[PDB]
Each structure stands twice: as structure tokens, then as C-alpha cells.
């Protein structure tokens, strides 16, 4: 069913269950879809979130509640809570702090708490926390760090904490890759390492779920697909390897996405082809198959 | 014990009003929720009910009629015209939140939630509504008394006969450990009652003889599932557990409880046995039709 | 170092004053403490504030 967006759709996101979908567009509206038990996606609600185009959206962990965060060229991020009784979603808060148009917003892993990051044309990554879970309006600004200027994407490590430490990859412009970690009790983000050999503009980056694997994997959709393997070992405690590169798109790779398990990677591009990837026994990636449109 | 793969995780089973030969069944958890009447005994899918809405309540509303309660706390009933193989959907109510069990007091199909909406015999208007929030035990101790048992396993005799919205009495364990899954009320006398402990215990009850916890146990493994009892031998009964398990506690025998059923499968659907199932806490697919 | 900060964090020089430098006595710099009423009012001044922040980063007084 047609998204019902007048202007172009920037982002689509699934909830935790995978039953709900959120969309955002340049028409300034966010639509939420319900996958009915009868299998047709029907939109639950659509509302005018922002004054300017809405680039990005994300869903928080379902333990906190039904929360969607949005990101706009109006320089704001908004948090919304679903009201069962309904106008369906209410603004919890606004983040005015970004002095420029924001490219992306992502919730952190559930173990961390309500935490989110955002990156903007100001090139300042900001992290906001809700220090009280009860007060969904109480969003404090946890941290601010400087990057460079142009493109942007964010992607947290989804690794459950207790097992692993928090870290986040930021991909702006490029072939240049920037990576950041969290310090012990400095409570500040440090630049552990960088992803090298980035090619063209990094349209997208995602960290893969590290379920049952010691090492971590991040894939970038530049105008080439790359996969990087991070391993901490033990001052410094980081290493990267580059697992694979893939140009069979022959063009811009706009989206890179991972499976829930991290088993499958997907890539899409200007060929209009979507490729699914599996890891070999050798840890090389292979294309399982290609969808077209 | 002739098993049969429905290839459909069963949620309901009735030895129908018409021995335990006319089987009917309601299959929840499918993309268009399912139920079949006259199935199977032999294919006999005369009324494999194409149906939106799932099965919360379920009753053979006649030998040619079928009552049921639908997934959102909706209501659903047709008249099983087994001659011409079609039917007519009798009852369709919207918002009676699902219902948690099913009781009867003929022919006001009383029930409980996990609020009470007393529909009745041709009472297409919701007549009585003692809208008391419940924090799954439901029966007719005497017409039209009942006892709501909240998920603290917290029984409380109320009514719909006289006016009022409180309960009249309350049955309770010392610790309220388990939740409202499976209680018992004897056909030997409608003032005799028990329950099954979700640890694998009994919880036998005395109405007149005080209100004490008469008989616990420690026999089964999982949550209290449901009990096959003979529909005429009140005493004959056998026990179960929430993997779908079944320990034959020969209670017309004296503790004679063994590894009873064709075991080790997933869960069982819902109980009616006369001359059959004793459905578990998780309602998967299983069958055997040799109940004598 | 959180425990050390707490030991440092517990002591207070005087009320009422924004003694981050009290923390500096601690020797631990916190961005939160650094977080600009004049900057907020400004909403050239911003550039000057940025220059001041850079100089501070490059002294504490």
C-alpha cells in the first residue's frame, strides 16, 4: 500500500517485534504501520512531526514503552510516545541543541537505558539520556563530540552490555572511516580507531549483532560495500580487519542492513538490486541471492 | 490411542453434546483462526470453520448449535446444522481484553476475565454487568452464584442473582503463589471443589467444612494444565502438567499415579471426556480417541 | 576513577559559587560542569565563545 507520503520517503524502520513499521518523509509526517494478523500492512497513524523534512527515525526498546524518535532538517529531534487510548502519538520532548540540520538519530542498546545519539551538519555527535525512566520528558544531554562536515550516519554497537563495552561508528563523507568508543570512568567518548579504505560518500553504516561471536562486524554502504571486523585485545585495545569489498552493484550502495541475529547482511543500490549476504566458514562474505525491482 | 496430526496447534476439544465420538475442535494461533466440527473420527471436515477471531469461550450451544467467545473478548456462536452442512452465526458481540475461562449456568453463559458481561439465552442485549475489575476461576456453585479467582489464584464467591458488585465470600491459600490457571469444582456435589497447584500440587477445597486448604500435592512438574475426569464416574480422574504431560492419578481407585498418556509431546488443547482431552496450559496439537 | 571523583565530589569549598575549579583541585575536568549563559543569550559572540573553549582545551583559570 502506497506509503501515503506526498514527498520522498527518507527512512523506514521496524519495531522490536518487526510487526510495526515507522516511515518518515520530506512531507514532514511520520506514518506508523500495523501489520494486521490478517496479512496486510495498514497505517496506524500519520502526523505532522516537524516544520522541515524528516530524515531519520528510530524505535526505542519495548521495555521503556512505545517510543519513536525523529530527526529533521528543522534542527530538532523529537521523541514521541504512543497513546493506546487515541493524535495517536504525543511529543515527549524536543531537542533544540543542534544548531544545524540533523542527518541521523539512533537509540542506544536497551541495557544502557534510554539513550540516543544524533549527528548533524554542525558535525557534533550528541548523546541524550533519560536519567529517570519514569520521566520520558526528562532528556539530559550526556555528551558532545566533534567530527567533520558533510554526510553523516550513526550506528551503535547492539552488543548486550555486561559482555561488552559501548562504542559507536560514525560515517561522514568519505574513503574515510571514523570510529569511537567509551572510556572507563572519564565517561567520555574516545577515538579508538578509524575504518580505512572508505570509498565515495558513506551513504550508510550499520553495526551487526555480535550474537555468539567474540568479534564485531560493521558494514558500510559507500558506493562500494565493505565489511570490517573489529577485535579488542589486551594502552590501546583495538584492531580492525577488512573482511570483504563488493562492487557488484556497480554504483551507489544506499542502504546496508543486518539480520536480527547478524547472520545475513543486505545491501541495496542504484542497480535497483538488493543483495543478501552470508558469511562463509572462512569468514568471507558470499552473496546468497539478489532481489530486483 | 489413535493419534492424528491435524497439523494445527489445537486449542479446544469437545466430546460434543449429541459417547466421546463427535469430536469438535477449535484451533487458535493460525492466520485465519480455526475450528472444525464433525472432524474427524473419517476425514469429516463438515464444519472446518473459516473464521476470523480466535477461541476464548467455546460451548456446544446445542447438539446442533455452537457457542464461543472471540479473541478480543468478542463473542461468536453459530448453530451447527449438521444436516445441510451450513449454519447461521447466532451471537456476535464486540467488547464483552479477552476472557480467561468459560463457565456455564444454563443457559446464561457466564464467564470471567483476566469485568463480567452476562449475555444469556437469547439475551442479545448485555443484561447483567457487575463490572468489577479482576486482578480465571469461573463456575456455577449454585445458580447463579459464582466465584471469581484472580491471578493471585484468588477465589471470591460473588453472584449475578441478587444485586451487588462485591463478592460474597473468598477462598484463598496462605501464600498466593501460583496464578489463576486451573481450579476444580466437583460434579459429585456443587458445593465440593478443589484446584490444581501450578507446582504440581492439588488444592482441594471445602465449602461447608471450613475453608481450609484441604489437599495440596507435589506430583506434577509444570503449571496446572487440566484434568480428564469421567463424566459419570466423578471420582475417576487423572492428572496432568503444562508441557502437555499427564500423570494418571487413579482417583476412582490409593495414590496410583503413573506416566499416563502418549506422553512427551507438546501441549494439549481443552477438556471434554465422556465414555477426549485434558488441555494443557499451552495448547498445542495432540489427539487420541480411545477413551473407554 | 569514579570512586576518586566521588571522594573529590563530596567536599565543597563554599556556597554559593560555580566552583568547577573546586573539581580542578580534584584535578578532574567535567564537560557537564563546563556546560555558557552568555552563549545561550547569544543563541560573532558564538565564535568568540568557541575560541574561548578552544583556548581552555589547549589555563584552567
From Swiss-Prot, chain A:
GO molecular function: structural molecule activity
WD repeats: 4-43, 49-86, 97-138, 146-190, 197-234, 248-287
Gene Ontology CC terms: cytosol; GATOR2 complex; kinetochore; lysosomal membrane; nuclear pore outer ring; Seh1-associated complex
Keyword Membrane found: yes
InterPro entries: G-protein_beta_WD-40_rep (IPR020472), Sec13/Seh1_fam (IPR037363), WD40/YVTN_repeat-like_dom_sf (IPR015943), WD40_repeat_dom_sf (IPR036322), WD40_rpt (IPR001680)
Subunit structure: Component of the Nup107-160 subcomplex of the nuclear pore complex (NPC). The Nup107-160 subcomplex includes NUP160, NUP133, NUP107, NUP98, NUP85, NUP43, NUP37, SEH1 and SEC13. Component of the GATOR2 subcomplex, composed of MIOS, SEC13, SEH1L, WDR24 and WDR59. The GATOR2 complex interacts with CASTOR1 and CASTOR2; the interaction is negatively regulated by arginine. The GATOR2 complex interacts with SESN1, SESN2 and SESN3; the interaction is negatively regulated by amino acids.
Protein purpose: Component of the Nup107-160 subcomplex of the nuclear pore complex (NPC). The Nup107-160 subcomplex is required for the assembly of a functional NPC. The Nup107-160 subcomplex is also required for normal kinetochore microtubule attachment, mitotic progression and chromosome segregation. This subunit plays a role in recruitment of the Nup107-160 subcomplex to the kinetochore. As a component of the GATOR2 complex, functions as an activator of the amino acid-sensing branch of the mTORC1 signaling pathway. The GATOR2 complex indirectly activates mTORC1 through the inhibition of the GATOR1 subcomplex. GATOR2 probably acts as an E3 ubiquitin-protein ligase toward GATOR1. In the presence of abundant amino acids, the GATOR2 complex mediates ubiquitination of the NPRL2 core component of the GATOR1 complex, leading to GATOR1 inactivation. In the absence of amino acids, GATOR2 is inhibited, activating the GATOR1 complex.
Entry protein name: Nucleoporin SEH1-A
Native source species: Xenopus laevis (African clawed frog)
Taxonomic placement: Eukaryota, Metazoa, Chordata, Craniata, Vertebrata
Amino acid at each position: 500500500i502506497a506509503a501515503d507520503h506526498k514527498d520522498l520517503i527518507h527512512d523506514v524502520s521496524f519495531d522490536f517485534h518487526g510487526r510495526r513499521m515507522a516511515t518518515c518523509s520530506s512531507d514532514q509526517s511520520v506514518k506508523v504501520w500495523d501489520k494486521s494478523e490478517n496479512g496486510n500492512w495498514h497505517c496506524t497513524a500519520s502526523w505532522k512531526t516537524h516544520s522541515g523534512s524528516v530524515w531519520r527515525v528510530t524505535w526505542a526498546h519495548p521495555e521503556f514503552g512505545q517510543v519513536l524518535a525523529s530527526c529533521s532538517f528543522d534542527r530538532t529531534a523529537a521523541v514521541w510516545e504512543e497513546i493506546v487510548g487515541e493524535s495517536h502519538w504525543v511529543k515527549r520532548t524536543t531537542l533544540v541543541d543542534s544548531r544545524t540540520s540533523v542527518t541521523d538519530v539512533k537509540f542506544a542498546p536497551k541495557h544502557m537505558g534510554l539513550m540516543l545519539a544524533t549527528c548533524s551538519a554542525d558535525g557534533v555527535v550528541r548523546i541524550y539520556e533519560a536519567p529517570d525512566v519514569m520521566n520520558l520528558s526528562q532528556w539530559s544531554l550526556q555528551h558532545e563530540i566533534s567530527c567533520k562536515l558533510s554526510c553523516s550516519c550513526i550506528s551503535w554497537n547492539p552488543s548486550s552490555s555486561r559482555a561488552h563495552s559501548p562504542m559507536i561508528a560514525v560515517g561522514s563523507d568519505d574513503g574515510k572511516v571514523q570510529i569511537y568508543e567509551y572510556n572507563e570512568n572519564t565517561r567520555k567518548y574516545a577515538k579508538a580507531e578509524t575504518l580505512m579504505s572508505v570509498s565515495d560518500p558513506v551513504h550508510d553504516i550499520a553495526f551487526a549483532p555480535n550474537l555468539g561471536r567474540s568479534f564485531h562486524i560493521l558494514a558500510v554502504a559507500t558506493k562500494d560495500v565493505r565489511i570490517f571486523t573489529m577485535k579488542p585485545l589486551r594502552v590501546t585495545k583495538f584492531e580492525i580487519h577488512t573482511v570483504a569489498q563488493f562492487d557488484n552493484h556497480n554504483s551507489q550502495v544506499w542502504r546496508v542492513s543486518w539480520n536480527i541475529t547478524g547472520t545475513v547482511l543486505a545491501s541495496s543500490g542504484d542497480d535497483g538490486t538488493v543483495r543478501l549476504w552470508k558469511a562463509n566458514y572462512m569468514d568471507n562474505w558470499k552473496c546468497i541471492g539478489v532481489l530486483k525491482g | 490411542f489413535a493419534a492424528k496430526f491435524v497439523s494445527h496447534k489445537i486449542s479446544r476439544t469437545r466430546w460434543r453434546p449429541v459417547q466421546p465420538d463427535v469430536f469438535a475442535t477449535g484451533s487458535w494461533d493460525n492466520e485465519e483462526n480455526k475450528v472444525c466440527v464433525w472432524a474427524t473420527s473419517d476425514p469429516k471436515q463438515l464444519c472446518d470453520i473459516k473464521h476470523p477471531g480466535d477461541v476464548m469461550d467455546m460451548q456446544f450451544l446445542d447438539k446442533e448449535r455452537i457457542v464461543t467467545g472471540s479473541s478480543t473478548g468478542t463473542v461468536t456462536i453459530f448453530r451447527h446444522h449438521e444436516n445441510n452442512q451450513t449454519l447461521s452465526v447466532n451471537q456476535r458481540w464486540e467488547q464483552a481484553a479477552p476472557c480467561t475461562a468459560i463457565v456455564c449456568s444454563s443457559p446464561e453463559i457466564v464467564s470471567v476475565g483476566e469485568r463480567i458481561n452476562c449475555f444469556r439465552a437469547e439475551s442479545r442485549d448485555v443484561l447483567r454487568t457487575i463490572d468489577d475489575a479482576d486482578s480465571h476461576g469461573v463456575t456455577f456453585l449454585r445458580t447463579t452464584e459464582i466465584l471469581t479467582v484472580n491471578s493471585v489464584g484468588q477465589l471470591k464467591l460473588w453472584d449475578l442473582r441478587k444485586q451487588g458488585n462485591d463478592p460474597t465470600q473468598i477462598f484463598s491459600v496462605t501464600g498466593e503463589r501460583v496464578p489463576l490457571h486451573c481450579v476444580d469444582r466437583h460434579p459429585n456435589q456443587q458445593h465440593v471443589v478443589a484446584t490444581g497447584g501450578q507446582d504440581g500440587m492439588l488444592c482441594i477445597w471445602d465449602v461447608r467444612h471450613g475453608k481450609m486448604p484441604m489437599s495440596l500435592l507435589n506430583a506434577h512438574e509444570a503449571e496446572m494444565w487440566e484434568v480428564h475426569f469421567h463424566p459419570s464416574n466423578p471420582d475417576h480422574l487423572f492428572t496432568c502438567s503444562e508441557d502437555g504431560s499427564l500423570w494418571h492419578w487413579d482417583a476412582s481407585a490409593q495414590l496410583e499415579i503413573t506416566n499416563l498418556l502418549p506422553s512427551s509431546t507438546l501441549s494439549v488443547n481443552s477438556l471434554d471426556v465422556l465414555g477426549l482431552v485434558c488441555g494443557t496450559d499451552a495448547e498445542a496439537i495432540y489427539v487420541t480417541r480411545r477413551l473407554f | 576513577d569514579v570512586r576518586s571523583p566521588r571522594l573529590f565530589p563530596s567536599s565543597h569549598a563554599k556556597r554559593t559559587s560555580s566552583m568547577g575549579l573546586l573539581q580542578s583541585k580534584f584535578a578532574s575536568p567535567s564537560i557537564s560542569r563546563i556546560s555558557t549563559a552568555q552563549g545561550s543569550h547569544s543563541p560573532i559572540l558564538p565564535v568568540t565563545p568557541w575560541s574561548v573553549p578552544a583556548p581552555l582545551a589547549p589555563v584552567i583559570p
